[PDB]
Amino acid sequence: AQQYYPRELSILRLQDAMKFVKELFTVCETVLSLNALSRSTGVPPELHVLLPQISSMMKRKIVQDDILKLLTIWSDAYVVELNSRGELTMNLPKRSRTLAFVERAESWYQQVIASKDEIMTDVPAFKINKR
């Protein structure tokens, strides 16, 4: 076109992905914080239990891969634990987190579009290995 060629179009796609993971982080923050209060151990239910809550707040069906995008931006954002059956459980780490995430999200976005190759259109899911 005039202003936007394939590379620029990919950047625009990525910006929507940035907007997505930023909102998703905030939603995970409210859900995990609230659910971590329900039990004496301070440990929330498995992630698959909390996904309907996360989905309703996001007004869209959120899956585990969406959640893992957050760790790509901030690896120490949450603590990841795999149980006996391999079911994923996420939890807040032991001590503003929202501001910290946005800064890293911005910095991550900067480094992606900075170099002149091919631009990814979405945040890749963080890779989790077996315990």
Numbering used by the authors: 294 to 388, 398 to 433
Reproduce text from the manuscript describing this model.
The process of eukaryotic DNA replication begins during G1 phase with the loading of the minichromosome maintenance (MCM) heterohexamer comprising Mcm2–7 subunits into head-to-head double hexamers with double-stranded DNA passing through the length of a long central channel. This topological loading requires the Origin Recognition Complex (ORC), Cdc6 and Cdt1 proteins. In budding yeast, Cdt1 forms a stable complex with MCM before loading. We propose that Cdt1 stabilizes a conformation of the MCM ring in which the Mcm2–5 gate is held open to allow duplex DNA passage required for helicase loading. To understand Cdt1–MCM at an atomic level, we determined crystal structures of two non-overlapping fragments of S. cerevisiae Cdt1 spanning amino acid residues 1–438 and 495–604.
The fragment comprises a pair of well-defined domains corresponding to the N domain (residues 14–298) and the M domain (residues 299–430). domain (WHD) family and is predictably similar to the geminin-binding M domain of mouse Cdt1. Further division of the C terminus of Cdt1 showed that fragments containing amino acid residues 271–496 and 495–604 interacted with both Mcm2 and 6, suggesting there are multiple interactions between Cdt1 and MCM subunits. By docking the crystal structure of NM Cdt1 into the Cdt1 density, an MCM interaction can be modelled, whereby the middle domain of Mcm2 is sandwiched between the A-domain and AAA+ domain of Mcm2 and extends to contact the A-domain of Mcm6, following the outer perimeter of the MCM N-terminal domain. In summary, Cdt1 makes extensive contacts with the outer perimeter of MCM, notably being sandwiched between the A and AAA+ domains of Mcm2.
